[PDB]
């Protein structure tokens, strides 16, 4: 496969400070294209990517309505959730939703997703068959019964197999110059003496898109997994990402180390070494 569209919705109750805040951001791969916040002066689905701006008034209205409705539904679910767990009305709780579809290079459905987490813990999820559910506990089983009784999975499947894949294919076409362009990482190795005895070799990867990348250090061709410090891939802010892997090596042994970079925008994976 090669592409995904996904919505990340967060509903957080805040007793004594109004109704639960709802925010939904939509992404095509690692590119955000829309956002919605119930706390905005006038909540509406708004563009966060150039290629989505061409969508008409009808698109913005329908999605604004969908999210205003999801805001109301998550507020109702947070209330239900509190009861399922015998929790008081005084605490703050979070309900997150993650849904969408992945398509292969040919644009056909690879897989659909529709899952929920309550207070950071998986709650219920539509199985890969788009027909059944996995409930994490007895409270989620209540949600499962209700969804099964209303034949909810059939609707989700209809969205994930049709509407969802259709939108993603349309977004991919409209934003092909960026969405379908892989920017390979610009790479280099820095060297930082620690003492007379050791030095840090840090291997950099910058300016790459999409975020998926693997940086590994080898000493004498042997991977140094346990001895490598790896930071989390981080957004540079211009749509691209950055990452680095470091290893503390004995002074004079730097040449026994090689960094290997794998990224889809690279024809072949790179091998680098500190060049003094």
């Amino acid at each position: 496969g090669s592409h995904s569209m996904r919505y990340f919705d967060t509903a957080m109750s805040r007793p004594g400070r109004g109704e639960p805040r709802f925010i939904s951001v939509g992404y095509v791969d690692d590119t955000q294209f829309v956002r919605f916040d119930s706390d905005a002066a006038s909540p509406r689905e708004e563009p966060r990517a150039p290629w989505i701006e061409q969508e008409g008034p009808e698109y913005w209205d329908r999605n604004t309505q969908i999210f205003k409705t999801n805001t109301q539904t998550d507020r109702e679910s947070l209330r239900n959730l509190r009861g399922y767990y015998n929790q008081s009305e005084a605490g703050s709780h979070t309900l997150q939703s993650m849904y969408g579809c992945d398509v292969g290079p040919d644009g056909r459905l690879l897989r659909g997703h529709n899952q929920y987490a309550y207070d950071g813990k998986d709650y219920i999820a539509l199985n890969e068959d788009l027909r059944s559910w996995t409930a994490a506990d007895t409270a989620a089983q209540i949600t499962q019964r209700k969804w099964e009784a209303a034949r909810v999975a059939e609707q989700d499947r209809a969205y994930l197999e049709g509407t969802c894949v259709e939108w993603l294919r349309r977004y991919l076409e409209n934003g092909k110059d960026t969405l379908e362009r892989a920017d390979p990482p610009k790479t280099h190795v820095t060297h930082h003496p620690i003492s007379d005895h050791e030095a840090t070799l840090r291997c950099w990867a910058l300016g790459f898109y999409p975020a998926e990348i693997t940086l590994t250090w080898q000493r004498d061709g042997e991977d140094q997994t346990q001895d490598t410090e790896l930071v989390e891939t981080r957004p540079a802010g211009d749509r691209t990402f950055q990452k680095w892997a470091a290893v503390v090596v004995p002074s004079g042994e730097e040449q026994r180390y090689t960094c290997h970079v794998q990224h889809e925008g690279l024809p072949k994976p790179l091998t680098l070494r500190w060049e003094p």
């Binding site: 939509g26 689905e45 999605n63 969908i66 679910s77 239900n80 209700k146 969804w147 969205y159």
Partner: peptide, 8 residues
């Protein structure tokens, strides 16, 4: 485009 979800 998003989808109207269901109450838990």
């Amino acid at each position: 485009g998003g989808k109207k979800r269901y109450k838990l």
